Amino acid sequence: MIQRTPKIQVYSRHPAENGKSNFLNCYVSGFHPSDIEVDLLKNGERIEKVEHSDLSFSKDWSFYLLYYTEFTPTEKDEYACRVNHVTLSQPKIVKWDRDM
Amino acid sequence: NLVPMVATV
Amino acid sequence: GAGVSQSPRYKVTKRGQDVALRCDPISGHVSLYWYRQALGQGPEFLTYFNYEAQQDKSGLPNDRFSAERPEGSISTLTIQRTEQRDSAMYRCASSLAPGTTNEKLFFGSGTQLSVLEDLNKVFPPEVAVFEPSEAEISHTQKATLVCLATGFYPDHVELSWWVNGKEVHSGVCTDPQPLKEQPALNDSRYALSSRLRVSATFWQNPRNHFRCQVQFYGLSENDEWTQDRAKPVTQIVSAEAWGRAD
Amino acid sequence: SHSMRYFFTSVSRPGRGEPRFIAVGYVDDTQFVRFDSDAASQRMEPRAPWIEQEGPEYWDGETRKVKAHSQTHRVDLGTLRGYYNQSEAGSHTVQRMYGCDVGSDWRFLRGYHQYAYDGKDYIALKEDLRSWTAADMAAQTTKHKWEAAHVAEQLRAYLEGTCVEWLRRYLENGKETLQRTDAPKTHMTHHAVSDHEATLRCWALSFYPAEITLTWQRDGEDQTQDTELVETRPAGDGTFQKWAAVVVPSGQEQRYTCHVQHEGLPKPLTLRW
Amino acid sequence: DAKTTQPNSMESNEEEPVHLPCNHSTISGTDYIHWYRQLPSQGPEYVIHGLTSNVNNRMASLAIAEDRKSSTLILHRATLRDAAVYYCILDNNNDMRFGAGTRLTVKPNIQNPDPAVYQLRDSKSSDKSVCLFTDFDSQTNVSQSKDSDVYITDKCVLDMRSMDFKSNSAVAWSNKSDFACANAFNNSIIPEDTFFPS
C-alpha cells in the first residue's frame, strides 16, 4: 500500500465575472486511499451547500473527486479549498486564484 | 450494461 | 457444519397456522438459497442471500412467505397462515461465494412440510410381513419376503429391513412412492410395499430373524390431541418373520 | 473513437459495518450511472439524460447486478486479507475496472478487466482477452481459480458482445450529446513573476471530449524545459479545462507560441502573446 | 419462459452409455451450462458444468455443441445407482434456476427371465396374502389397477449383490374376498412362460 497525497485544483466553472453567478470547483485527484475531507471556504468559513461527484479513479488506480457549490464572485470575497487526508499532517488550503 | 457477474478472488 | 443442515426433517402443520423452517449452511458459505419442490417437479426457486442480504426474493409466492438470515449464517423461512397448497419439500442450499467462479451449490436433506386442514386425518402406519411362497422357493431357489405398510398419512415414512438385527440393503427394493388406498381423496391414506429377496437356503434357516421397520413422522410433542385413539406421534412400527425350513 | 467503462470501489471499515461500495459507469468522458451502498435508494441511478429513457427492466437488472458486484467485492476483502496475512483492524481497498473500446467505425477495438488491492495492480486480463497477468503469489492463486472457472472466456464474451453492443446503443440514444464535439475556447494570460521573467499561461476551456494536447514552441520548435502542464479537469457542466504554462525571459514573449489540438477543431490552433 | 428444454423421461440399460440431451437455443457467450442430478429421496447435487469446452470428470462428461445451442451429459457406463432426475441448467449470474429435468430409468439386464406370479401369505396368523409378479424381462410394463379396490405397485428392481443377480417385481393385493391373483396381473400385462402356480 502506497498512500498518495491529493493534487488540488481550485477554480471556477465559467470565466469569473464579479456579480455573475457561477460555480466554485475544488478538484482533488491522484490520491490514495479514498477517504478524504474537502471543504469550500468563503472568507475562511465553511460553505454549507457543497456537492461532490461520485467516487471514481484513474488508470493508475488513484482516486479523484470534484466538489462544487454555486457562488457569486466579488472583488473582495476570498475563496479557498481545504483538504484533509491521511497523508496530510495538517489541512491543506489552496486559495482560489481567479487571475490565473 | 454491467457484466452479468464478476469473479471472487 | 461440514454439510447443509435443515430442521425439522418432517413437519405436520395445521392449515391457518404459521411455520418456521431452519437452514444451517456449510460454515463460511456466503451464499444461501431456498427452494421448494413438488412431486414430479424440479426445485422451484424461492429466495437467495449473500451474507445477511436478501439479494433476490422474486421466487416468494406471496406475502405470507418471508425469509431472514440475520447474521449471515442461519436462515429461517417463515410461512404465515399456511395453506394446503404450501405443502412441499423445502430445500436449502449454500455455496462458498457468489460470482463467475461458480462455486457449486450444496443441498441439504430438506424439510417435508405437510399442511393439513385437520390433524385428525393423521394416521400412523400398520405393518405386515408376508412370507415367500414355497412355489417361488422350489422353482427359483430364492425367497422373496414382502412388507406392506398401510393406512398412513401424511406420506411421512421411511421403510427399512432388519435381519438378525442388522439393516440390509442388498436384495431389497422399496416402492419409490406410495399408493392412495382411496384414489378419489386428495386426503387419502397411503400404502407402501417393499421386498427383500434372499436365498432359499437363508430363508429356510429358523434362526434367521427378519423385521420390516417403518419409521413414521407425525404430530409433535406440542400438537394438541383430543381423539380417543393414541396420539399419532413420530414412532416406529415393525412386523417380523422367522425363517422356516418347511 | 469510443469507450464504455465501469469503475468499482469497495473499502472495508473494520469497526463500522460492511464495506462502502461505490460504482460508476461512463461512456467516453460522460458519467451515466452510479450506485452507492450507503445511499438511500439502493438502486442503480441515472447521471446522464439519455439513459433515463431506459425502461424499468433495465434499472431492475442493473441494480441486481451492481449489488451482486458489491457482495462479491465484500468476499474479496475477506479473502485478500487472508492471502496477505493481515489483521482485522485495518481498512483496505479493492477496485475493479472493466470496459471496452470501439473505433470511429463502431467496430470492436479492445477490451479490459483489471483489479487492484490497496491501490496496486493485483491481477489483469491481457489484451488477448484469454490470459491473465498476476502480480505476486496471492494473485497467482486467484489466477489459477479464474483459469479453472474459465473466467477469461466469460469476460471475453461480454467484452466482444454485450459491452460493445450496449456502448453502441448508448452512443445512438445519446448521440446529441455524446457525439457532439465542443472545441476548446482558447486564450493566453501573462504574469510577471520577477524583474526579468514572465509566465505565459495558455488556456483551453469548455472542450469535449477530454482528450487534448497543449504544447509550447519556441521559434516553431517543440519546447519542454520550464513548461508546466496541469491535469485536465472537469468544469462541472460536462466539459473540460486545461492549461499549459512556460516561464520565458521578459521581452522574449513573442518567441513563444502555444499549440492546441482537439477533435473539435477544424485544425490545430496557434496562440501567441 | 423456460431457458433449457429436456425430454421429461428417458430410459437406458445398465452397464451401457447414456446420452442425456438438453436444448438451450437462446444462449449467450456469458451463459454457463450446469448439470445437477437428484437421486431418489435426495436433494439435487452437482454433476458438471462448463462454458464452451467439453468437460470431463469422475461422474460424467459434458458435450457442448459448437454453436452452444445444445449440450449432452454423458454417462459412460450407467449403473442402477444412476437412475435419477438430471437437470440441465442455463445460468449467467448464480440464479441457478431449475427446470423439470429428465427422469432417467436404468433397466437391469435380465438374462434368464422367469416370468412368474406367486402368492405369499401373511406371517401373522391372519388370512391376508399378496401377489408377486416377479422375474419378468425389463421390457414388461406393469400398469396401475382399474378396480380402485385393487392395488398394484409399479415394478421395482432389486439387486442380490453377492450373487450378481437382479430381478424385477411388482406387488398386488386387495381386501375384497373374491380377489385372486389373475385379477390384477391379467393377460393385459403378463407375457407367456408366466409360471402361474396354485
GROMACS .gro file of C-alpha atoms in nm, chain E residues 35-37 45-49 57 59-60 73 75 86:
model
   14
  663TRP     CA    1  -2.597  -3.026  -1.483
  664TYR     CA    2  -2.726  -3.136  -1.142
  665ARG     CA    3  -2.877  -3.471  -1.052
  673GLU     CA    4  -2.627  -3.246  -0.627
  674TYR     CA    5  -2.370  -3.103  -0.866
  675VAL     CA    6  -2.255  -3.320  -1.155
  676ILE     CA    7  -2.073  -3.100  -1.403
  677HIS     CA    8  -2.070  -2.758  -1.572
  685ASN     CA    9  -1.479  -3.551  -1.452
  687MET     CA   10  -1.906  -3.871  -1.274
  688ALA     CA   11  -1.957  -3.770  -1.634
  701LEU     CA   12  -2.444  -3.514  -2.040
  703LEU     CA   13  -2.285  -4.132  -1.854
  714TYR     CA   14  -3.092  -3.498  -1.439
   0.00000   0.00000   0.00000
